[PDB]
DNA sequence: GGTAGATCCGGAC
DNA sequence: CGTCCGGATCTAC
C-alpha cells in the first residue's frame, strides 16, 4: 500500500488492538524479521507487552508497546487483519501476534516482501529502518527550500530524488509520476536543472497529490490519451522504475 | 561520501 | 516461461 493507505491502516487498526496484551507471537516465515536477527528472540521479547499506540512514518507503521516499538513495512502486498484465534488463518500469513483476549493481529503477504524490526522505543528512531528517513511530505519540515537544497547537490534525475527516502518519507512511484505530471516536469530531468519556480510548483503538487489521497493522470495509463491534452501517455524506465509521463504536458 | 548495483519475493508475462 | 518488477537496505565501486 501507498502512504495514504498506510495512514488509513494506522487509523483503523489502532482501536482494534489498543490496550491488548501479547500472549504469543507465531512466525511462519522468519526472514520477515530483521531485528533482532533471531526470530525466536523477536517473539520472546514481545510476549507480555501491551499495545499502547500506532504511529506512521513514511510507509512504516510503528506499533508502540510497553518497552518496545515494532516497526513494520508492508511493501506492495502486505496486509494486517485482526481476527479470532479460533478461525483458520488466511493464505500467506507469515506472522501472528496472539492477544490474551483470544484475538490476533495477523500479517499476510503473498510476496513475502515486508519487514519487521523490534527495538526499545527510545532506540527505534535512531536505528534501521527509521534512522535516515526524510521529513513527512505533509509536514512543514518538507518545504520548497529543503527540496531545492537536495536537488542542487545531486547529479541525479528529479525522479530519483523524489524516490529517495532520505529526501522525503514514503513518496511512492505512483505519486512521483502523478506529482511530476501535475507540476509539468519531465521525470528524466536532472534535479539540479529545475528552476526555483519549478521547485516550488513541484513541492506544491507533491503536497496536493498526497494530501488529496489521504483526505490518475499518467500512472499505468501508457498508450492512453492524456486527460489534459490528449497526447498518448508514454512509459519508460527512470531510476530503475516504470515511469509514466505526458511528453507534451511535461517539460 | 554519493551513488549504482545487488538483494529479497512470487505472480504474471 | 526465464525474466520482470516494486521499496528500501546493504555493499562496494
Ligand atoms: Zn498531456
- CB-CB contact of A187 with A170 (8 Å): no
Catalytically annotated residue among A59, A62, A159, A189: A59
Nearest of A110, A104, A111, A109 to residue A88 by alpha carbon: A104
A111 touches strand B (CB under 7 A): yes
CATH placement of domain A1-132: 3.20.190.10
Nucleotide nearest residue A153, measured CA to C1': B2
List the binding residues of A for Zn(2+).
Answer: 226, 229, 246, 249
Nucleotide nearest residue A111, measured CA to C1': B9
Question: CA-CA distance, A206 to A10, in Å (whole number)?
Answer: 21
Question: CA-CA distance, A51 to A63, in Å (whole number)?
Answer: 7
Q: Which residues contact A198 (CB under 8 A, 6 or more apart)?
A: A183, A185
Indicate the Cα dihedral angle A33, A36, A40, A43, nearest 10°: -80
Which residue ranges have CB below 7 A from strand C?
Answer: A 34, 58-60, 73, 75-76, 111, 113, 128-129, 131-133, 163, 165, 170, 172-174, 237, 241-242
Distance from Cα A46 to the centre of ligand 1, integer Å: 52
Where on the phi/psi map is residue A23: left (φ > 0), alpha (ψ -120 to 50), or beta?
alpha
Q: Which residues contact A143 (CB under 8 A, 6 or more apart)?
A: A203
A28 touches strand B (CB under 7 A): no
- Largest Cα–Cα separation, chain A: 60
Is position A187 annotated as part of the catalytic site?
A: no
Do strands A115-120 and A53-57 pair parallel, antiparallel, or not at all (unpaired)?
unpaired
Bridge partner list, A243? A236
- CB-CB contact of A153 with A180 (8 Å): no
Q: Which residues contact A67 (CB under 8 A, 6 or more apart)?
A: A49, A120, A121
Residue A237 φ then ψ, to 5°: -105, 125
Q: For residues A72-102, b (16+ Cβ closer than 10 Å) or e, as one string?
A: bbbeeebbbebeeeeeebeebbbbbbbbeee
Distance from Cα A219 to the centre of ligand 1, integer Å: 13
Burial of A188 (0-12, 13-18, 19+ CB in 10 A): middle
Nearest of A171, A177, A181, A178 to residue A150 by alpha carbon: A171
Is position A1 annotated as part of the catalytic site?
A: yes
Is position A247 annotated as part of the catalytic site?
A: no
Instruction: State the span(s) of chain A assigned CATH 1.10.8.50.
Output: 133-251
SS (H, E, C) chain A: CCHHHHHHHHHHHHHHHCCCEEEEEEECCHHHEEECCCHHHHHHHHCCCECCEEEEECCEEEEECCCEEEEEECCCCCEEEEEECCCCCCCCEEEEEEECCCEEEEEECCCCCCEEEEEEHHHHCCCCCCCCCCCCCCCCCCCHHHHHHHHHCCCCEHHHHHHCCCCCCCCCHHHHHHHHHHHCCCCCCEHHHCCHHHHHHHHHHHHHHHHHHHCCCCCCCCCCECCCCCCECEEEEECCEEEEECCCCCC
Way it was determined: X-ray
Nucleotide nearest residue A160, measured CA to C1': B3
CATH fit for domain A133-251, picks 1.10.3720.10, 3.40.140.10, 1.10.8.50, 1.20.120.80: 1.10.8.50
Instruction: State the span(s) of chain A assigned CATH 3.20.190.10.
Output: 1-132
A160 touches strand B (CB under 7 A): yes
- CB-CB contact of A166 with A146 (8 Å): no
Residue pointed to by grid coordinates 502512504 = A3
List the binding residues of A.
Answer: 92, 111, 226, 229, 246, 249
Instruction: Write out which nucleotides of chain B lie closer than 7 A to a protein Cβ.
Output: 2-5, 8-11
Peptide bond into A36 cis (omega under 30): yes
Resolution (A): 2.2
Amino acid at each position: 500500500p501507498e502512504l495514504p493507505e498506510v495512514e488509513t491502516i494506522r487509523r483503523t487498526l489502532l482501536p482494534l488492538i489498543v490496550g491488548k496484551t501479547i500472549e504469543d507471537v507465531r512466525i511462519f516465515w522468519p526472514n520477515i524479521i530483521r531485528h533482532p536477527r533471531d526470530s525466536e528472540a523477536f517473539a520472546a521479547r514481545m510476549i507480555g507487552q501491551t499495545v499502547r499506540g500506532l504511529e506512521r512514518r513514511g510507509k512504516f507503521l510503528k506499533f508502540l508497546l510497553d518497552r518496545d516499538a515494532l516497526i513494520s513495512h508492508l511493501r506492495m502486498e502486505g496486509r494486517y487483519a485482526v481476527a479470532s484465534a479460533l478461525e483458520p488463518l488466511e493464505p500467506h500469513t507469515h506472522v501472528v501476534f496472539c492477544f490474551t483476549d483470544g484475538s490476533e493481529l495477523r500479517y499476510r503477504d503473498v510476496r513475502k516482501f515486508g519487514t519487521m524490526h523490534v527495538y526499545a522505543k527510545e532506540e527505534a528512531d535512531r536505528r534501521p529502518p527509521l534512522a535516515e528517513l526524510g521529513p513527512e511530505p505533509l509536514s512543514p519540515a518538507f518545504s520548497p527550500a529543503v527540496l531545492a537544497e537536495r536537488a542542487v547537490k545531486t547529479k541525479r534525475s528529479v525522479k530519483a530524488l523524489l524516490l529517495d527516502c532520505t529526501v522525503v518519507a514514503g513518496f511512492g512511484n505512483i505519486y512521483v509520476d502523478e506529482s511530476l505530471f501535475r507540476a509539468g516536469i519531465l521525470p528524466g530531468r536532472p534535479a539540479a536543472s529545475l528552476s526555483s519556480k519549478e521547485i516550488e510548483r513541484l513541492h506544491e503538487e507533491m503536497v496536493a497529490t498526497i494530501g488529496e489521497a489521504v483526505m490518475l493522470y499518467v500512472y499505468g495509463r501508457q498508450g492512453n490519451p492524456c486527460k489534459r491534452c490528449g497526447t498518448p501517455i508514454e512509459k519508460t524506465v527512470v531510476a530503475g522504475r516504470g515511469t509514466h509521463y505526458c511528453p507534451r504536458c511535461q517539460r
